[PDB]
Ligand binder design. Structure first.
Ligand SMILES: OC[C@H]1O[C@@H](NC(=S)N/N=C/c2ccncc2)[C@H](O)[C@@H](O)[C@@H]1O
Ligand SMILES: OC[C@H]1O[C@@H](NC(=S)N/N=C/c2ccncc2)[C@H](O)[C@@H](O)[C@@H]1O
Ligand SMILES: OC[C@H]1O[C@@H](NC(=S)N/N=C/c2ccncc2)[C@H](O)[C@@H](O)[C@@H]1O
Ligand SMILES: OC[C@H]1O[C@@H](NC(=S)N/N=C/c2ccncc2)[C@H](O)[C@@H](O)[C@@H]1O
Lengths: 810, 810
């Protein structure tokens, strides 16, 4: 049907159809009389997956023969979403499969909906890892993602009585066709035990062993015939484990619990032993695998020439002392040489400056679980502090600030300090964030080793986040400028010369309307909710956090409702306000915020005077597959974190690419987005970082805003008095108390500017032609935010390798 | 190479080779450069399994269209062993696959050794279920085996320092190619809760739910194109289970523990709640599946015409009250009608008379776990006892003996009594066993309802137990009498006319020698032990139990050693004495017996004077795949249980079919074997059942034998004084104490006759020609012991269906 989806050749369609039938029969053991819709999905998945294998084998063969430098991306999170459509897109099979299934009397889109998301991440950090894998394959890098194969990913969110309920994401229940178990590479991981010192070095003895069994998932590049590997480890008890008899077998569960479940905390540290075990498990198994591959090329001097390890935050920080442990204790290298190798091998990416998110592990935990690593960390700290003392003689406070060991009630290890000390490169994820790292939390480190500190602004893959989710937009762009932009997103600049093109303006607006109609229809079918598709789609989707300020959005919504109630017969631009995202199960305030949103909806959506002029909808179970649907449908992207709190954001980039305008603070990558698009084409409001700093010096007094803004006082009075909870008058007292007395994120301080800015959004939307022209100016300048750009910068500036867009032979 | 292994057609070999390569590539994601031996096994398994699918789909289609009466074989054990060779045999693919793999440069036998046994059983009862499935498919019956998919089967046995060690049988670790998950037939199973009585019947409420997910395994008939199903249930937690957050996810393990592990007790009852849960789990899921299939044919009068349920011992006895529960509480049938349906549907097979093996569940357990079933059991008991009272007025002791409820310290439910009451047929598993049931333990029941009591003598499948494991023997037989005997084993009688045939005598002896050489070579390679292949192979393989009297075998072994030591320069017929089998982990005496065997070996095998005249070897990890190797190699089959204790035996039949002579008591099926072969062609010794009864009346005094048999006194003195355990003089004191003072199985009473009989065995072995002629007379009369005969009798006399040897079209 549409060009960017590829060719539907006669031979190809015929072959797909027969391979589909072969799989239905031989693989699924069904015929068309008894086959379930799930059977059809699996038949199709198997048919598509067959097309990966030749390329996958030859890619890995090629790496073995050419021996390039290998890149190892270590993450506890890979937020992959669904795989079927992505594989079809990257192999140019989409149109052919659509045709093949159509001829078999099946709707491919319906089949696609059957696939579970691989929800192995919480949000931004995990999705970033996934976009990165796509870009690394597309750029022909010899890259491997390494992580954990969680049996349960991020929980499925159900809303019951306006409250978040969690249920287990049993994503492997029907079997995962996109993985291959690799039992021959099963490896032992050690825990507990004790350290003996012999005549010939330290030895780690009396350990408990858990096996790490790898599962490989293919990562196809975009039409370049490259298929890289994501290798995820699963925990397995050894067979003699605990070996009355029955109990010993049942107790195997204890060891295998390591890979059971993803910790559902977004930007928050929880010092639990099981989490520490997960972090070591991935690191120990991965490093053995890396070393094995390196030896199958004795001389560890060449190790950094053949290996780069990228640490996705501090979660895999134990890679540093683990590498030292293997090099010193097992390979018998001297400390200084091992350390040189380690530093040149490792690089560290920081993802937040929020203090509660930073990993600070109690010493007593590491002492019991990882005694040799603790000793190695102490030694690293001593040698590091000796360097600081020599550089800054007599500066005793600097020594305590820079220490890897934090003193206090319980001694803790600061993992971020460990990462900086043991990495040749430290990067933030947007320009303002990287500057904040140098100026504030890592200032001491920057002064010691300025050359270590870099910026690498985040990006998103235009395959998933344009071609896959928004084929209509991809097509109208390709019609004017060709297909090359899909792997060279900077080419979107060419669209600037179409900003006054009446045909293009109409097509851009038409694609948006179609997307909105489709999404409005999705909402009725799967959720029985009614929305006006001619309204402005105002969306904020992202994890629920105080710093992300869904509450400020709530305040605006109530403002609009109150204004309508006061002047019912005045025209207002109709809006559908959509808010979605999961709250960490233990985060009370975030759970209260969800209840508030639904409570507002309950009042607003049933007020006869309001009509279809204002609707508030909570988008349940926000996840990658839902983002692919809602983002193409959005008109207005809410990116409203307090300045200095959102390191980068990536949801912001997704909306920009898909034709929504942005209302946002100058925070994270919003700054660079406004810079690329021009500030005239962005709805910027609120305090800058400098303004927040000024307010902190004076002391933030929320009462002042309450006293001076009548519209704000009304809202607080409504919340307090039970207007939004008639049968539980004090339900939202915690929210009011927080806003009035202990608001770290200064919700009231940005309220007036936000409401004014929102008025300017409504004004522009009234002029569809000018709305669309500004949209074109956003899409046209979204090129910088391709993860291909980001990865090219990591490659050249950190890993020391050159990207290549050249095809491997098919 | 050999005829019974089938044709290796040009087209077939070519096609197998290309399908093997296709699977290696697409399924296993390997090429020949990196493929592991395990990869090759899997490629072959997939290639063979592809040949099942068409037949499997059309068999099940045929049942749906023809709607025959369906047979449901319920067992907690299906001891399947390996599947690859069995599938090749039954599809006539063995020679073709051998040729195809040979041309690919691979040895198929080596590949076969990679497959894990499906060890989902303990011994005889579980293997019987497996032989039965093979025979039911071969006889074209619409039969389904239903059981539990244990994650861990029978433990792997390791011998360390002469002691049994257990390790987890993680048989699914690499994935099972012989199963297909059927998620669409996932069913809820209920536990705990309470009973409410409403205006319209009882209701079982507030229950905990565990899901039962089925996995289907194909059961191919022998060259008849029939493929039946074995459906095994796996336990899955529902997704809202226990739904701080992390713990709730980890706690899902509790529900899923139901299908985690097989209880490793052979002929012994352990009243553990987890075991009770397993028993209900299989019954509840299976009955829902049966009822679903029956409705997809309201009128439950026709239920027994379309359904037979065979209970493999009392393990699935809860089928009776569960069927009543569904019929009365859910379908709203009156009690009397439901009961009529239940009795006509169910039949019960008893497998032992040993009192410690009988299931007697504490009332308090059933009260908590299954409150509605307990109430139903009470009601069954009341109505049953009312029938007994009417038949035998005033016989108050009969009422207490026949009650389903046993009084005492803890009240218990006798599950065997439940089974008799609720079944239209009760059978024992050999003629003497069935007679013992009528005369002793079920005498009261037999007097009430004599028509219920039947015999069905056990059998073994001649596919696995001749063609598969002993192709050389199968071939020399087929050369004289054709191939028809493989599914009509009575045809073996024709071999009687070859008993004086010099060519056949030589061929029978040659096949045995070859088997012995192969087994002697297996022992060196995989265990580094040296044996004389010209010695008589004296083997006792079966689970370790006091009743099976491995100890009596030990006494003979020591007797032979002592006799050699006394007269070193006297000729004796050389023997290799092989004993193997697992002990239940909690059975102390059985574990001591294993240690004794190895301790004897340690003395005997290292005595220079003995030479290669006597060797004692403990066969480690005895299991189905090991039986397939050792049984063909045996000369002498030890079947030496105390008369009246081994219900049937099936190992005995396996040895008879494979050309070993039997030394045995008149116990179980040994009686019928001697009857078929003629007593002159069997080495019978020892007390008959009547003699044991006489001894019990007088009181068994072991001391009398010790006092009157000098050779026996010497052995006991050696055991006591530490001759077989120099550094732990009293190691075997428990064994001596048991033999002298509390021997339930009268080891000493059969000692003299056993040793004498063994002398007659040695005498015959000295005359190879006469040894072989007696062997021919055993093989020739082994036909009755085909499980095809057994199943034909169940079909005609219990299930009310006719077997058919007719092919389905291919
Ligand atoms: O079918 C479900 C099972 O599939 C298996 N995959 C096998 S046999 N081949 N895959 C090959 C493959 C080829 C190309 N891209 C991905 C995988 C997985 O090992 C197993 O964990 C999973 O449960
Ligand atoms: O860079 C990708 C995205 O990462 C997000 N971080 C997330 S999801 N978790 N971090 C968790 C964390 C845990 C422990 N120590 C530091 C951070 C950032 O908040 C976002 O601005 C950014 O766009
Ligand atoms: O490969 C390992 C996996 O195989 C799967 N089998 C599938 S996809 N088809 N089988 C078809 C089949 C055809 C004929 N005879 C048996 C099975 C099983 O469902 C899964 O439990 C197992 O882990
Ligand atoms: O019939 C097949 C074989 O079954 C065996 N029984 C075994 S393995 N377990 N029974 C366990 C059991 C448990 C509970 N209540 C009764 C028996 C018999 O011992 C054997 O003679 C016979 O050949």
């Amino acid at each position: 049907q549409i060009s960017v989806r590829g060719l539907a050749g006669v031979e190809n369609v015929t072959e797909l159809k027969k391979n589909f039938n072969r799989h239905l029969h031989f693989t699924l053991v069904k015929d068309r009389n008894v086959a379930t819709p799930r059977d059809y999905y699996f038949a199709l998945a198997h048919t598509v997956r067959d097309h990966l294998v030749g390329r996958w084998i030859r890619t890995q063969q090629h790496y073995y023969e050419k021996d390039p430098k290998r890149i190892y991306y270590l993450s506890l999170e890979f937020y992959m979403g669904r795989t079927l459509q992505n594989t079809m897109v990257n192999l140019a099979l989409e149109n052919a499969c659509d045709e093949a299934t159509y001829q078999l009397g099946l709707d491919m889109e319906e089949l696609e909906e059957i696939e579970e998301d691989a929800g192995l991440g919480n949000g931004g950090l995990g999705r970033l890892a996934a976009c990165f894998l796509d870009s690394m394959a597309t750029l022909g890098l010899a890259a491997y993602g390494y992580g954990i194969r969680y049996e349960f990913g991020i929980f499925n969110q159900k809303i019951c009585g306006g409250w978040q309920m969690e249920e287990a994401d049993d994503w492997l229940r029907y079997g995962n066709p996109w993985e291959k178990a690799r039992p021959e590479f099963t490896l032992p991981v050690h825990f507990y035990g004790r350290v003996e010192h012999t005549s010939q070095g330290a030895k780690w003895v009396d350990t408990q062993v858990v096996l790490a069994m790898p599962y490989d998932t293919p990562v196809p590049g975009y039409r370049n015939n490259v298929v890289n590997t994501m290798r995820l480890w699963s925990a397995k008890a050894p067979n003699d484990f605990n070996l009355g008899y029955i109990q010993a077998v049942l107790d195997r569960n204890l060891a295998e619990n390591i890979s059971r479940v993803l910790y559902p905390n977004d930007n928050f540290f929880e010092g639990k032993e099981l989490r520490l075990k997960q972090e070591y498990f991935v690191v120990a198994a991965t490093l053995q695998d890396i070393i094995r591959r390196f030896k199958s090329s004795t001389n560890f001097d060449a190790f950094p020439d053949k290996v780069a390890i990228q640490l996705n935050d501090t979660h895999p920080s134990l890679a540093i002392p683990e590498l030292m442990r293997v090099l010193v204790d097992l390979e018998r290298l001297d400390w200084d040489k091992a350390w040189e190798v380690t530093v040149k091998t490792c690089a560290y990416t920081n993802h937040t400056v929020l203090p509660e998110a930073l990993e600070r592990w109690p010493v007593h935990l590491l002492e019991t679980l990882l005694p040799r690593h603790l000793q190695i960390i102490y030694e690293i700290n001593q040698r590091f502090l000796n360097r600081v003392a020599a550089a800054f003689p007599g500066d005793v406070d600097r020594l305590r600030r820079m220490s890897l060991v934090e003193e206090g009630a319980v001694k803790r290890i600061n993992m971020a300090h460990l990462c900086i000390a043991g990495s040749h490169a430290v990067n933030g994820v947007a320009r303002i964030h990287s500057e904040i790292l140098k100026k504030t939390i890592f200032k001491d480190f920057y002064e010691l080793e300025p050359h270590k500190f870099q910026n690498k602004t985040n990006g998103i893959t235009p395959r998933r986040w344009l071609v896959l989710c928004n084929p209509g937009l991809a097509e109208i762009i390709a019609e004017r400028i060709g297909e090359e932009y899909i792997s060279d997103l900077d080419q979107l600049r060419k669209l600037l010369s179409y900003v006054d093109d009446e045909a293009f303006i109409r097509d851009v607006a038409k694609v948006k309307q179609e997307n909105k109609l489709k999404f409005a229809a999705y909402l009725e079918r799967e959720y029985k909710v009614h929305i006006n598709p001619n309204s402005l789609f105002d969306v904020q989707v992202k994890r629920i956090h105080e710093y992300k300020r869904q509450l400020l959005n709530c305040l605006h919504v109530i403002t609009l409702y109150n204004r309508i109630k006061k002047e019912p017969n005045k025209f207002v631009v109709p809006r559908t306000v959509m808010i979605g995202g999961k709250a960490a199960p233990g985060y009370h305030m975030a759970k209260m915020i969800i209840k508030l949103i639904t409570a507002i909806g309950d009042v607003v959506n049933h007020d006869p005077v309001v009509g279809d002029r204002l609707r508030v909808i909570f988008l349940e179970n926000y996840r990658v597959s839902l983002a692919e649907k809602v983002i193409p449908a959005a008109d207005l992207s809410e990116q409203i974190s307090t300045a200095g709190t959102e390191a980068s954001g990536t949801g912001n980039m997704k909306f920009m690419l898909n034709g929504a305008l942005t209302i946002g603070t100058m925070d994270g990558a919003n700054v660079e987005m406004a810079e690329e698009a021009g500030e005239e084409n962005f709805f910027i409001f609120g305090m800058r970082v400098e303004d927040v700093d000024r307010l902190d010096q004076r002391g933030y007094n929320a009462q002042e805003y309450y006293d001076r803004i009548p519209e704000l006082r009304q809202i607080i009075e409504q919340l307090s008095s039970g207007f939004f909870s008639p049968k539980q008058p004090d339900l939202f007292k915690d929210i009011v108390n927080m806003l009035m007395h202990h608001d770290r994120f200064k919700v009231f301080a940005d309220y007036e500017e936000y409401v004014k800015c929102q008025e300017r959004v409504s004004a522009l939307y009234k002029n569809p032609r000018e709305w669309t022209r500004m949209v074109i100016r956003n899409i046209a300048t979204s090129g910088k935010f391709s993860s291909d750009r980001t990865i090219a910068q990591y490659a050249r500036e950190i890993w020391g390798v050159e990207p290549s867009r050249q095809r491997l032979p098919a």
